[PDB]
């Protein structure tokens, strides 16, 4: 019998990739998709000017968020020192010929 | 005209408390009502004997 | 005990905890909430913009 410790993904499929920026003093970036917790989010500082959109000038926050879905994973089961059986084969030299299996 | 930076929360109230404790093998604990941002979670360790 | 696809190993737990890949835990429920999920992606911007 086994007990499932952690599982590790590998082949990730990414979609829906949201993104939101804020004018350089209008707070941190945000988007509703962050409340989903399936999605991956980072907040970098980007430029901003009149040729960027809105702002004074300077650097404003930008979050981008991507869906995270997995395809391959390790199950990672546990072994406890009970629960096991060793098989031991006893074999006597004597009346037997060309055996061994 | 004024922009809107961080609000905050200075007075909270909590709803139903959910727990999900896991054995000393079979690893750490999950609690399905986690993975939404409305619930706030932290993990600790318990004896979990007979 | 460790299962990749059909191949199976015996590894150390002090090895297996330390792997920086997104882990699941034990809750076997829907959106498996992959913790980490930051290892397996990488957020790359331009020089300044997008």
């Amino acid at each position, epitope marked *: *019998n*086994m007990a499932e410790v952690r599982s590790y993904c590998y082949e990730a499929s990414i979609s829906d990739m949201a993104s939101d920026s804020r004018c350089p003093t209008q707070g941190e970036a945000y988007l509703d998709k962050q409340s989903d917790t399936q999605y991956v989010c980072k907040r970098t500082l980007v430029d901003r000017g009149w040729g960027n959109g809105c702002g004074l000038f300077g650097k404003g926050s930008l979050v981008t968020c991507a869906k995270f879905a997995c395809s391959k994973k390790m199950t990672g089961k546990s072994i406890q020192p009970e629960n096991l059986e060793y098989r031991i084969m006893l074999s006597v030299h004597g009346s037997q010929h060309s055996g061994m299996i | 005209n004024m922009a809107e930076v961080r609000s905050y929360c200075y007075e909270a109230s909590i709803s*139903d*408390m*959910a*727990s*999900d*404790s*896991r*054995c000393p093998t079979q690893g750490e604990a*999950y*609690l*399905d*009502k986690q993975s939404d941002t409305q619930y706030v979670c932290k993990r600790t360790l318990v004896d*979990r004997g007979w | 005990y460790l299962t990749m696809n059909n191949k199976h190993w015996l590894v150390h737990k002090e090895w297996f905890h330390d792997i920086p890949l997104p882990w699941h835990a034990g*809750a*076997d*429920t*829907g*959106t*498996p909430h992959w913790n980490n999920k930051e290892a397996l992606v990488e957020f790359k911007d331009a020089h300044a913009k997008r």
Partner: antibody
Framework: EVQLVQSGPDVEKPGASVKVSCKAS????????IHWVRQAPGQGLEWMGV????????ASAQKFQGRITMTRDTSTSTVYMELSSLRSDDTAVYYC?????????????????????????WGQGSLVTVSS | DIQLTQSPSSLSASVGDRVTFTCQAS??????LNWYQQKPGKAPKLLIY???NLKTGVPSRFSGSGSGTDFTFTISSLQPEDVATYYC?????????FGQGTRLQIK
């Protein structure tokens, strides 16, 4: 007496979500795991999952992870199972019964079983029909 | 996920007969099996917990046995209120599997 009583039959649309209640009587509500078990009419029984009425933790089968959610209500001593992403395969009768040695949470496998493993409490069941 | 085969599919016997049911799991479930009879669409009648034990309130005409993976349920005397669909249930490893079923008919 020791009895679980459910809600009436429901008719839902495909793609919607259904909620089935399971109220306890005659025993301490936080002492017995509530197991949910489906039954199609042209098929036998099939275990959907398990909630602990203490602490509200869940677990379920591989055929329904992501589709099922189980909540509790310790005040009214009631168990809610919400099945989402309904299809025509989900037209069935849903059951909810105990199983003891329900001290802390989750499952409790290798410790003791039996004596209404989950036999007794079941009551009337809940017909759930998914169509238009 | 242990597959739990229940033999046979359906039976028929007269009142007062002895009948046996077999459940075979693909893996070792050593004493972790139990037995249901379910009247159609009703609250059921109780047969067996822990593959060999009767519960209080159950009439003693039902019995169960089985040690490794093969389990035998036994009705000593069939009665007209024992027509039901008979199920067996694994306990181990928790994708908890039921048998397909065993129906009876009154001759």
């Amino acid at each position: 007496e020791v009895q679980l009583v459910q809600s009436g039959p429901d008719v839902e649309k495909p793609g919607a979500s259904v909620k089935v209640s399971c109220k306890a009587s005659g025993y301490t509500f936080t002492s017995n795991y509530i197991h949910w078990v489906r039954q199609a009419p042209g098929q036998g029984l099939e275990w959907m999952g398990v909630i602990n009425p203490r602490g509200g933790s869940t677990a379920s089968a591989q055929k329904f992870q992501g589709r099922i959610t189980m909540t509790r209500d310790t005040s009214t001593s009631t168990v809610y199972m919400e099945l989402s992403s309904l299809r025509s395969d989900d037209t069935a009768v849903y059951y909810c019964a105990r199983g003891g040695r329900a001290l802390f949470y989750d499952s409790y496998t290798t410790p003791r079983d039996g004596g209404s493993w989950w036999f007794d409490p079941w009551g009337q069941g809940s017909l759930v029909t998914v169509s238009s | 996920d242990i597959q739990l085969t229940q033999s046979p599919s359906s039976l028929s016997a007269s009142v007062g007969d002895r009948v046996t049911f077999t459940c075979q799991a693909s893996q070792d479930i050593r004493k972790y099996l139990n037995w249901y009879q379910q009247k159609p669409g009703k609250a059921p009648k109780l047969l067996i917990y822990d593959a060999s034990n009767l519960k209080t309130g159950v009439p003693s005409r039902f019995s169960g046995s089985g040690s490794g993976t093969d389990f035998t349920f036994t009705i000593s005397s069939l009665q007209p209120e024992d027509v039901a669909t008979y199920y067996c249930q694994q306990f181990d490893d928790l994708p908890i599997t039921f048998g397909q079923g065993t129906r009876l008919q009154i001759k």
